[PDB]
């Protein structure tokens, strides 16, 4: 049971306490004496239960294990290879929508460096397309089928965590030791992501010019944000410097294109307790340890995962 409060800050009433200064007991090395220690958590990690008393969001879904701080989550290039008697054929066509015959095929033993980047809404540090931007879809007419967009020129993105966190090293047991988030050194600021609006301008123009090749030429194409649901789907879920960001993409997909110098900043939230991929069974949940210092990362936006609405015979757009 966590006895939590707001963090030490005086701001206007239009600022919900994202961070909570929590206090609780803990078992020390010995299984006798407890431990009145405090930590700092994000609001997404905790949930009230009926002085505000909370719990962790996952206590009622699954067990939990912390990710060791020694290991890292850095996407590295993986080349996939096949055994003897087999080979990997690589289409060498510049314009190829993935399905059908490939005029210029070559063969290879191991593919190129494919970084396993985990994101949801925007593909990052990917492979750029050649010449014209690429659209790929299993069935364009079916509004239930995703539309994967691969970019020709990369869009520069900059995500930062402006909070010089502190790592508290609690001793929970004779071997284990937990890494809580100590006090913040500096200002109470929010994580955000920047997108140069010029490059994004031209990129959106170049994708709509390719869309018009499939939906009639003199038509209007509108962009709206996600519909709703989980945070993992409604935000550009990803990991950067170890913290798991969840950014609002409502400022990127609110446009409308007819037949014919600043950065767009995005409010990015952070979550430490994530349970993707079901949790390896029905039990395990991972706590992303707190990271000391301000994290800044520059990435490429190299693709999108779009979905179209089911208007049927609704409009020309």
């Amino acid at each position: 049971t966590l006895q939590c409060t707001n963090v030490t800050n005086n701001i206007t009433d239009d600022m919900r306490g994202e961070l909570k200064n929590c206090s609780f007991n803990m078992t020390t090395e010995l299984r006798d004496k407890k431990q009145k220690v405090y930590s700092l958590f994000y609001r997404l990690d905790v949930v009230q239960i009926n002085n505000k008393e909370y719990r962790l969001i996952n206590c009622n879904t699954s067990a939990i294990t912390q990710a060791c701080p020694k290991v890292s989550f850095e996407p590295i290039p993986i080349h996939y290879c096949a055994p003897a008697g087999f080979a990997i054929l690589k289409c060498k066509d510049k314009k190829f929508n993935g399905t059908g015959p490939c005029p210029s095929v070559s063969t290879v033993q191991c593919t190129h460096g494919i970084k396993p980047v985990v994101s949801t809404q925007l593909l990052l540090n990917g492979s750029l397309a050649e010449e014209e931007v690429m659209i790929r879809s299993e069935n364009i007419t079916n509004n239930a089928k995703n539309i994967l967009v691969q970019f020709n020129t990369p869009v520069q993105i900059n995500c930062t965590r402006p909070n010089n966190n502190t790592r508290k090293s609690i001793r929970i047991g004779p071997g284990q030791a937990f890494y809580a988030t100590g006090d913040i050194i500096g200002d109470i600021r929010q994580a955000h992501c920047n997108v140069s609006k010029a490059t994004w301008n031209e990129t959106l123009g170049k994708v709509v010019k390719q869309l018009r090749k499939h939906f009639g030429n003199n038509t209007i194409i509108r962009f709206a944000n996600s519909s709703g649901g989980d945070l993992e789907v409604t935000t550009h879920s990803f990991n950067c410097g170890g913290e798991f960001f969840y950014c609002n993409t409502s400022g990127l997909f609110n446009s409308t294109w007819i037949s014919n110098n600043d950065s767009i900043t995005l409010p990015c939230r952070i979550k430490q307790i994530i349970n993707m991929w079901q949790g390896c069974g029905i039990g395990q949940a991972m706590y992303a340890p707190p990271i000391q210092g301000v994290i800044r990362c520059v990435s490429n936006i190299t693709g999108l995962i779009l979905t179209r609405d089911g208007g049927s015979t609704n409009s020309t757009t």
């Epitope: 030490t8 005086n10 600022m15 500096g186 200002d187 109470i188 600021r189 929010q190 900043t265 409010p267």
Partner: antibody, heavy 132, light 106 residues
Framework: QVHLQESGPGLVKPSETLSLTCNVS????????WSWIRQPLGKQPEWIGY???????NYNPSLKSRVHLSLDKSKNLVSLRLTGVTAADSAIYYC??????????????????????????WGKGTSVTVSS | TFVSVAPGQTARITCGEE??????VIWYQQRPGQAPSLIIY??????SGIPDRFSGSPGSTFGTTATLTITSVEAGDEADYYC????????????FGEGTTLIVLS
């Protein structure tokens, strides 16, 4: 030139209504912020509150439910009212102009900033002793 | 609090709580029997009429107290000194910090 003059009764009985006026000379009250600052004897000056045209005014949370400030545009002066006085209000009340500023520490758009005020041109001040 | 420094040197005055965020300390000078006068209006920015080198510690360091350096200390600067701390993490301070009296020796 900017001359500020504080003027009031000087003696007010307990649980009464103090009323003060700051005669300003050299500039209009519509174009400036006006703050009042008392200072007990041997203590640190205590900021009371600020007032400006267009209804922008704020008080002290510790003295929230007792003070009322005003500006006389016609007669070009500042006005202060303090109801329900006690022995703690005896101090030297100053009338000063106030200049505003914004310090931005974050990215602005996130409301990551705050406004800070500072009084530059003081008045000579008036004395107020609470006694029966 | 009292600070003793010889004339023609550097004096240093501490005022206010420790810093918690980005701060914009405002410094004031109270001559004996007079009204406070402004010296520094944005944590090391002097207005017109204040001589050098009257300097304050930059409002970007987190975890230190506001310090006021007064180079070439004279007998005329002997006065009380108050501070208005503007901390991004703390509500508005309606009470100036406890003043510091400067003592010019000899």
């Amino acid at each position: 030139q900017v001359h500020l003059q504080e003027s009031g009764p000087g003696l007010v009985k307990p649980s009464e209504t103090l009323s003060l006026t700051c005669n300003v000379s050299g500039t209009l009250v519509r174009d400036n912020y006006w703050s009042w600052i008392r200072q007990p004897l041997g203590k640190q000056p205590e900021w009371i509150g600020y007032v400006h045209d267009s209804g922008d005014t704020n008080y002290n949370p510790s003295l929230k439910s007792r003070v009322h400030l005003s500006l006389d545009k016609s007669k070009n002066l500042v006005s202060l009212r303090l109801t329900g006085v006690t022995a703690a209000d005896s101090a030297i009340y100053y009338c000063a102009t106030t200049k505003h500023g914004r310090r931005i520490y974050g990215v602005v758009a996130f409301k990551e900033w705050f406004t800070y005020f500072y009084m530059d041109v003081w008045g000579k001040g008036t004395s107020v002793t609470v006694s029966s | 609090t009292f600070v003793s420094v010889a004339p023609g040197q550097t004096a240093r005055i501490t005022c206010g709580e420790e810093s918690l965020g980005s701060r914009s300390v405002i410094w004031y000078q109270q001559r004996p029997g007079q009204a406070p006068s402004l010296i520094i209006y944005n944590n090391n920015d002097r207005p017109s009429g204040i001589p050098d080198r009257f300097s304050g510690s930059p409002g970007s360091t987190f975890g230190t107290t506001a310090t006021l350096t007064i180079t070439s200390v004279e007998a005329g600067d002997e006065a009380d000194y108050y501070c208005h701390i503007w901390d991004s993490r703390r509500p508005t301070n309606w009470v100036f910090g406890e003043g510091t009296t400067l003592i010019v020796l000899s």
